[PDB]
Amino acid sequence: KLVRLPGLIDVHVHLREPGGTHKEDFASGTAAALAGGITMVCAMPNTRPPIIDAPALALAQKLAEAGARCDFALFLGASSENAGTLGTVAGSAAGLKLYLNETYSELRLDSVVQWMEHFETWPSHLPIVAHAEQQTVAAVLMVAQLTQRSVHICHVARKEEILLIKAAKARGLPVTCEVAPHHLFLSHDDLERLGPGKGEVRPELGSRQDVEALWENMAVIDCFASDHAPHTLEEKCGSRPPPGFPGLETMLPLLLTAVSEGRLSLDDLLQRLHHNPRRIFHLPPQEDTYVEVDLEHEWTIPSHMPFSKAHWTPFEGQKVKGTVRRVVLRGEVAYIDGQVLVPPGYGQDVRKWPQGAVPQLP
Amino acid sequence: KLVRLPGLIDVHVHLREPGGTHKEDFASGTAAALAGGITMVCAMPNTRPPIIDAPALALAQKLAEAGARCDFALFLGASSENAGTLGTVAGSAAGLKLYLNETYSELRLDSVVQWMEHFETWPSHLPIVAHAEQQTVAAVLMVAQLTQRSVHICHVARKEEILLIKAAKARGLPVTCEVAPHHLFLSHDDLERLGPGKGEVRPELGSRQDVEALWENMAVIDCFASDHAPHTLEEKCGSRPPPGFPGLETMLPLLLTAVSEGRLSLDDLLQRLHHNPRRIFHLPPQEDTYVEVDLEHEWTIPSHMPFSKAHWTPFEGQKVKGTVRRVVLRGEVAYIDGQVLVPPGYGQDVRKWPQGAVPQLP
Numbered sequence: 021k022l023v024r025l026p027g028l029i030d031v032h033v034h035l036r037e038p039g040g041t042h043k044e045d046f047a048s049g050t051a052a053a054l055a056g057g058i059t060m061v062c063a064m065p066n067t068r069p070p071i072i073d074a075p076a077l078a079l080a081q082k083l084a085e086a087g088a089r090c091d092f093a094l095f096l097g098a099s100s101e102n103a104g105t106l107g108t109v110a111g112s113a114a115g116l117k118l119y120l121n122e123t124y125s126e127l128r129l130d131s132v133v134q135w136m137e138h139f140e141t142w143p144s145h146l147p148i149v150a151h152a153e154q155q156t157v158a159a160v161l162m163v164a165q166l167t168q169r170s171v172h173i174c175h176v177a178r179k180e181e182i183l184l185i186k187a188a189k190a191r192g193l194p195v196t197c198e199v200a201p202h203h204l205f206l207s208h209d210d211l212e213r214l215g216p217g218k219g220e221v222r223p224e225l226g227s228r229q230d231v232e233a234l235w236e237n238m239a240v241i242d243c244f245a246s247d248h249a250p251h252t253l254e255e256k257c258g259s260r261p262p263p264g265f266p267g268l269e270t271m272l273p274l275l276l277t278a279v280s281e282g283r284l285s286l287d288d289l290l291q292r293l294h295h296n297p298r299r300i301f302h303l304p305p306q307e308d309t310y311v312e313v314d315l316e317h318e319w320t321i322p323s324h325m326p327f328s329k330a331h332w333t334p335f336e337g338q339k340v341k342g343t344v345r346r347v348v349l350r351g352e353v354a355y356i357d358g359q360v361l362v363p364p365g366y367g368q369d370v371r372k373w374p375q376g377a378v379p380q381l382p
Numbered sequence: 383k384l385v386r387l388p389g390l391i392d393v394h395v396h397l398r399e400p401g402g403t404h405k406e407d408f409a410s411g412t413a414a415a416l417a418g419g420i421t422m423v424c425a426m427p428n429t430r431p432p433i434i435d436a437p438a439l440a441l442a443q444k445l446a447e448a449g450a451r452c453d454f455a456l457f458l459g460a461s462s463e464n465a466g467t468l469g470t471v472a473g474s475a476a477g478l479k480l481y482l483n484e485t486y487s488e489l490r491l492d493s494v495v496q497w498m499e500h501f502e503t504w505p506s507h508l509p510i511v512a513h514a515e516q517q518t519v520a521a522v523l524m525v526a527q528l529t530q531r532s533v534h535i536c537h538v539a540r541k542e543e544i545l546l547i548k549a550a551k552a553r554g555l556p557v558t559c560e561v562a563p564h565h566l567f568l569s570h571d572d573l574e575r576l577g578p579g580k581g582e583v584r585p586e587l588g589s590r591q592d593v594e595a596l597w598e599n600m601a602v603i604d605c606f607a608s609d610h611a612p613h614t615l616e617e618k619c620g621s622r623p624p625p626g627f628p629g630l631e632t633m634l635p636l637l638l639t640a641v642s643e644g645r646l647s648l649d650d651l652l653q654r655l656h657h658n659p660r661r662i663f664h665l666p667p668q669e670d671t672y673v674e675v676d677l678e679h680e681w682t683i684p685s686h687m688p689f690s691k692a693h694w695t696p697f698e699g700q701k702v703k704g705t706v707r708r709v710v711l712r713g714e715v716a717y718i719d720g721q722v723l724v725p726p727g728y729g730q731d732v733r734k735w736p737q738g739a740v741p742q743l744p
């Protein structure tokens with residue numbers, strides 16, 4: 021007896037095209053998405069070249085339209101030079117991404133004044149998401165208040181961060197956040213096994229107390245999102261390991277396991293992988309789209325999942341209960357039992373659909 | 383023809399007693415204050431032991447009462463363990479100091495939640511000052527808003543910081559700030575001469591653009607304060623140089639030079655070294671107290687000033703115009719032309735004066 025879920029949405033993925041296609045491309049990363057029960061992804065802009073201007077966005081849009089197997093939206097990235105220049109194309113993007121700490125990106129902003137300039141110039145009705153760790157969460161919240169608008173905090177990983185956001189929500193401030201599976205299911209206790217190269221990720225893995233604080237404060241978490249950040253094993257195990265974990269194929273099985281154990285409800289899961297992504301990013305419905313899962317199947321995560329070109333996973337060896345059996349995307353069978361059955365290019369840019377534009381005053 | 387000034391107040395000094403008395407003690411640091419035309423100092427809590435609990439404050443109070451030559455108030459320091467424990471003694475302190483970045487202190491707080499706990503537990507009518515650099519300024523401002531109270535930002539040094547504070551003031555937020563003389567009169571252009579050891583200070587010396595932004599935004603600066611941070615030449619030139627500059631004896635001559643050049647007015651100076659310190663920290667008047675300065679005397683700062691045990695200065699070689707000729711403190715001649723004439727112990731804790739308590743609702 022399968023359970024039918026709506027088309028799930030991952031608002032934080034790195035698909036590496038253009039410029040890092042040995043790590044992943046649109047075709048491989050969206051195959052991984054479908055195998056993970058995800059039918060729509062929002063792709064981050066820290067590619068090579070980065071998606072920080074109109075020509076780069078135009079290129080990325082065409083590469084995605086030609087390679088994507090599921091539907092998508094593309095983020096623009098904030099840079100030290102592009103505030104005030106993105107107005108014509110802003111509404112075609114998922115939103116604007118700010119990189120406010122050291123991570124796998126060349127887009128760090130060097131002054132809070134540059135953050136203010138982005139918050140002041142980016143259209144006020146369109147999403148802004150921030151990579152903002154520890155005190156940076158409080159700093160970007162201040163900038164959002166000074167500019168009188170909302171912000172969404174990416175990959176919250178620490179007790180400190182979730183409690184700050186909790187306090188902000190208690191004061192009625194317009195802040196939402198997302199949490200990635202590695203910060204719910206891995207901790208410092210796993211760094212022995214992972215090693216210092218594989219274990220590199222931003223935000224770094226938290227303590228057991230961080231993990232327990234995120235679960236305890238599930239009500240404060242608006243979305244789950246994988247931060248699928250594929251890098252090859254050679255890169256993760258080499259001298260200058262880039263941070264990040266692949267995660268599209270493992271996210272839903274990990275969370276279904278938690279549902280089966282009573283750690284959160286099916287509704288809690290669907291708010292965080294469907295309804296809240298839709299409403300925060302104004303992402304449109306997908307007609308005739310659903311995911312069928314088998315909640316009874318017990319399996320052990322292997323050393324690599326079938327589709328991501330990362331060809332490794334930090335969840336290797338974890339026992340899960342729950343698997344994706346079938347995905348239907350816009351009336352076509354997209355995935356069955358380990359086989360992706362829609363070709364590269366089946367996926368569409370949801371921001372071009374009439375229902376996918378963000379509403380705005382004239 | 384001398385000019386009579388009121389008793390000037392430095393709200394940010396390190397007098398090193400207890401525990402670092404080779405760098406400075408109450409007697410030597412307050413002699414330096416008097417020679418710099420300063421009649422009241424607020425001493426920071428990063429001593430050894432640090433002033434982070436009632437017994438340490440009691441000791442420091444007695445050492446100051448016995449050694450100080452000018453009047454004073456003593457800050458308490460926030461620690462990772464003392465939130466909620468300072469209520470009985472809080473009103474006897476200048477205020478509470480938070481160390482939110484790496485600097486010469488063991489008091490760094492490791493989580494914004496600890497900042498929130500201090501803002502929630504410290505009595506709401508009493509001052510809070512923060513060492514908060516770059517984005518940390520925005521972060522502590524957010525914490526202040528969440529807790530619905532004011533904050534004072536220590537040693538603002540960068541264009542980024544002064545513009546953030548400017549934006550906060552434009553939104554009506556209760557924030558004040560101070561700037562130290564080295565961030566108005568030294569820059570990266572001076573690191574060649576100073577060297578990497580002497581030049582170590584927190585916040586670090588800024589660019590010419592940082593310095594010009596502070597001057598351009600003088601209206602945003604509420605106070606000048608020296609951040610007199612004496613360390614010996616051996617320490618500054620050694621393998622692990624501590625950050626900080628001595629500055630009590632040079633602050634007023636540097637600023638008088640700027641007044642003579644029309645860079646700010648005498649009133650601008652007196653707001654920032656007298657009236658605003660009084661009103662932000664609720665520091666009492668000093669009866670029969672004044673400073674006589676000679677605005678015409680041109681001199682070159684030497685390799686060390688007479689009184690601070692630091693026995694060095696980063697302003698060596700700068701030409702100044704303006705000198706302190708006489709200080710009268712509470713009816714006694716305290717300083718004339720290079721000689722301090724009040725003994726250790728003449729100075730008093732202003733928080734014990736009836737007029738020196740911070741007003742509060744019953």
Ligand SMILES: NC(=O)N[C@@H](CC(=O)O)C(=O)O
Nearest residue numbers: 034123124221222249263264
């Ligand atoms: N999280 C990571 O460790 N890496 C991400 C970048 C990011 O989300 O900050 C990546 O693109 O590799």
Ligand SMILES: NC(=O)N[C@@H](CC(=O)O)C(=O)O
Nearest residue numbers: 396485486583584611625626
């Ligand atoms: N500013 C510094 O560089 N040093 C100060 C500490 C401080 O004010 O942060 C000190 O106590 O030495």
Ligand SMILES: [Zn+2]
Nearest residue numbers: 123151174222
């Ligand atoms: Zn990130």
Ligand SMILES: [Zn+2]
Nearest residue numbers: 032149174175
């Ligand atoms: Zn995100």
Ligand SMILES: [Zn+2]
Nearest residue numbers: 032064247249
């Ligand atoms: Zn990411």
Ligand SMILES: [Zn+2]
Nearest residue numbers: 485513536584
């Ligand atoms: Zn400081």
Ligand SMILES: [Zn+2]
Nearest residue numbers: 394511536537
């Ligand atoms: Zn200060």
Ligand SMILES: [Zn+2]
Nearest residue numbers: 394426609611
């Ligand atoms: Zn200081």
